[PDB]
Amino acid sequence: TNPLKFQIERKDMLERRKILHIPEFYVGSILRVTTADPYASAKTSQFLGICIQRSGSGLGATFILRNTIEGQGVEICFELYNPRIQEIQVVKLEKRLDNSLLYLRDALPEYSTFDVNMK
Amino acid sequence: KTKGVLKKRCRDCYLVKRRGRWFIYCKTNPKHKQRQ
Amino acid sequence: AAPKNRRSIEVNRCRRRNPQ
Amino acid sequence: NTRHIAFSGNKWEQKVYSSHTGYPGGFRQVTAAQLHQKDPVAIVKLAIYGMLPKNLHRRTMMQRLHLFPDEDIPEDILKNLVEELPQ
């Protein structure tokens, strides 16, 4: 049962890693995701933002991205193994203290001081 | 349409009996059709 | 609530012996 | 030959057998026609089921009664007495 689920994970990761060269990223990293999904005339949709939360599960492993657009906060969750995504580029790399960036919802300057502190 | 007494309204009205009930049928006008 | 009537011996025996 | 039974008058379609369950609105009406088209041996049996006195002996003597829609009688390999009283 469980080792068969591990086999599912292995098979999925093989299928994805062969076709997709997308590098490994972690929570609190500034990324740019290309998307061919929408119906817009331009096939390429570039979304720049920092990943607030990533919980890997099976083939359905997803990561949530967040950024400030035109004064309004925009949060879009993408599937890591989603074939709709063309590529992903890492503009910057951060760490913080946790895989949960939810504390950034308040956007306080003190927490930003800590944000700048660690590597 | 539905009454307890069925009589011919005009000369062209015809009385019939079907399924244990009496009915009035008139080809000239449909308003003369009655049911008991 | 309160019992409507006093329990007979038979019912008492059958209740306290067989099912337990 | 319980299916070859013949009821007089218009009672064929006009006879209603009532079957009610514990559930609300579980009242079921089965005409003699459809019942004959489905389970005919029930009809005559019901006609007997109201004739006998109540309580025990009713069911006791009810188990002594057997009906079939068509003729197949392995019990006729066992010799029995035949009584003929047609109406």
Binding site: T62, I69, E70, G71, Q72, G73, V74, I76, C77, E79 | - | - | -
Partner: protein, 114 residues
């Protein structure tokens, strides 16, 4: 989106930026369910005027493949289903284009798409 939920107006020429004493509220949703979403028309109440508007934003996306907006925004319109405002602010979802072409006037007047 449900009744009594306050929404923001992104229309510049419609429902003027100058605020009243009572903030805009949502009376009813055209959908058979009290919970409305993007693409659904809603009946909103403003002081002195009761109007109709589309929902261009939501704080609670159902699917994982859909973006999430921090604030709920609406676009005012008329019975014909067209914006009465000459300008629209803030990004707009790409679902509105999939719905109908008659409503694409909003999409065409929108600055950005996510």
């Amino acid at each position: 989106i449900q009744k009594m939920t306050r929404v923001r107006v992104v229309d510049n020429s419609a429902l003027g930026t100058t605020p009243y004493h009572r903030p805009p509220r949502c009376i009813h949703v055209y959908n058979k369910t009290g919970v409305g979403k993007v693409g659904d028309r809603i009946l909103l109440a403003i002081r002195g005027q009761k109007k109709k508007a589309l929902i261009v934003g939501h704080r609670m996306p159902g699917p994982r493949m859909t973006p999430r907006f921090d604030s709920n925004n609406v676009v005012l319109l008329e019975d014909n289903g067209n914006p009465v405002g000459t300008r629209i602010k803030t990004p707009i979802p790409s679902s509105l284009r999939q719905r109908e072409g008659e409503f694409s006037k909003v999409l065409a007047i929108a600055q950005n798409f996510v």
